[PDB]
Amino acid sequence: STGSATTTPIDSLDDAYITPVQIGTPAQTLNLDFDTGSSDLWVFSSETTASEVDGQTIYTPSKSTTAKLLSGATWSISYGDGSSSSGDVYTDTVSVGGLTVTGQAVESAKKVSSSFTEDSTIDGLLGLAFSTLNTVSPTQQKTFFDNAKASLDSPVFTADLGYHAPGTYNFGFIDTTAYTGSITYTAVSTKQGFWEWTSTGYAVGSGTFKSTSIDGIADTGTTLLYLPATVVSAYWAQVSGAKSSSSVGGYVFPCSATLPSFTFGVGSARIVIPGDYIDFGPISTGSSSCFGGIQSSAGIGINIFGDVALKAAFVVFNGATTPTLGFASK
């Protein structure tokens, strides 16, 4: 089997991407944030504290003939940005782009943090990291991909995120029309539960490539590109007037600037992030200070190849017995 679904930016900045997901019988379609950095499929629901729901579409398990309470199971998750959610668990039928999993754990939120409430466009998350990170207790549950894997034509999914445009998540096949040149594959460590890999270096603009190992995670659920302070300083030094602002919470730059591109290495291959992908617009409405899309990972504890990086590539998440990651230009 295979599946193919369009993923759409939630706003004009590509702050996140939403993908429609069918849950239950008859189907209830919710728009979920596909997150290769976590491993829980959780949704706003009829059980979510009413004051914490503000425009989201909810899953109502009592209206699904295939929903079953997973008795005694609870979940609770916190993300890198300090947001969080928790609740109980149902199993139900879940379909993405024509690919159906029966008995998928659907984690129903009883509580969500303010950042989730305030984002009316995101009805929940669909985790695509390794199932070892799943938070359900006392019986850990599998991701949608893990459940689907044996049925797929090939044990893979691909992320093709757009810049200010829709893109595609495919399951079970590689669309050879969706990228240019060849796909370069690179080793993955699953030791921390992430799609963790080592970039071979970087360049700023038309500058020379610096060969240096940068361990990080491919994370569709993180907006920006978080890299070591040395690398990030080298990038922003090429933008007149750019500076790190403790008050704002990262590098800012004059909105009048033209940003240089940023290249990262994948083995001997190179992925080029155009300068415009690194612009996240005014820090507040009407400001002439703009927020940068490349930020320091210092104090995160891990480097994160988030959407800024991934949307410059066609990305293969290969879930074979020994997982790997592939990157192509597009």
Side-chain angles (χ1 to χ4, degrees), residues 1-62 64-67 69-109 112-141 143-148 150-190 192-242 244-330:
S1 63
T2 64
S4 182
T6 299
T7 192
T8 302
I10 64 165
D11 64 23
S12 66
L13 297 179
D14 298 346
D15 280 318
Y17 298 77
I18 50 172
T19 308
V21 177
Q22 282 71 48
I23 309 176
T25 309
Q28 300 179 40
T29 299
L30 274 64
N31 296 327
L32 305 186
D33 183 351
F34 283 23
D35 180 14
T36 63
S38 70
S39 305
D40 288 50
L41 192 175
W42 74 260
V43 296
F44 279 80
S45 77
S46 56
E47 302 179 327
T48 310
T49 300
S51 60
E52 297 180 349
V53 183
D54 190 1
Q56 296 81 10
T57 295
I58 61 165
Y59 169 58
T60 303
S62 66
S64 172
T65 59
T66 42
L69 180 70
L70 186 62
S71 182
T74 59
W75 62 280
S76 180
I77 193 162
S78 304
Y79 299 99
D81 67 340
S83 70
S84 63
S85 53
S86 62
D88 54 18
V89 187
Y90 293 81
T91 56
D92 209 341
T93 303
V94 173
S95 302
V96 175
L99 171 65
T100 301
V101 168
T102 57
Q104 174 64 45
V106 177
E107 302 173 35
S108 169
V112 304
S113 63
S114 61
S115 52
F116 287 113
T117 300
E118 291 161 2
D119 193 346
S120 66
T121 68
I122 292 173
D123 302 324
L125 267 64
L126 189 150
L128 293 169
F130 294 89
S131 293
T132 54
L133 293 180
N134 176 266
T135 76
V136 178
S137 178
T139 306
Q140 190 172 61
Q141 300 295 303
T143 71
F144 175 82
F145 177 55
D146 206 343
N147 282 323
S151 301
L152 294 178
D153 291 357
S154 181
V156 306
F157 68 90
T158 64
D160 181 7
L161 302 179
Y163 168 65
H164 293 350
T168 305
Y169 281 102
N170 290 331
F171 292 83
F173 72 106
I174 289 161
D175 181 357
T176 60
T177 73
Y179 57 87
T180 62
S182 50
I183 305 176
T184 297
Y185 288 87
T186 196
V188 165
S189 172
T190 63
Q192 294 191 88
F194 299 120
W195 292 91
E196 185 171 2
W197 65 290
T198 302
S199 173
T200 49
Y202 70 98
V204 176
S206 61
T208 63
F209 186 85
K210 176 71 171 184
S211 292
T212 184
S213 292
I214 305 171
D215 293 344
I217 67 165
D219 186 0
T220 58
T222 291
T223 312
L224 307 185
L225 174 53
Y226 294 90
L227 292 173
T230 47
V231 177
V232 176
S233 182
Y235 178 81
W236 289 109
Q238 298 304 310
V239 179
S240 296
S244 185
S245 167
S246 55
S247 57
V248 175
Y251 281 89
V252 297
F253 67 93
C255 294
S256 61
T258 301
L259 296 177
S261 64
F262 183 89
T263 300
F264 63 94
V266 181
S268 59
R270 307 288 180 253
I271 299 295
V272 179
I273 306 172
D276 294 342
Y277 290 26
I278 298 161
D279 178 19
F280 280 74
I283 60 172
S284 293
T285 302
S287 180
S288 71
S289 183
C290 276
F291 196 69
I294 294 178
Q295 297 293 345
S296 179
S297 64
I300 293 176
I302 199 159
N303 300 306
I304 307 173
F305 294 86
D307 298 335
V308 165
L310 304 182
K311 76 186 170 196
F314 177 88
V315 188
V316 180
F317 295 79
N318 170 29
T321 302
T322 300
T324 66
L325 271 173
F327 291 83
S329 295
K330 67 186 184 192

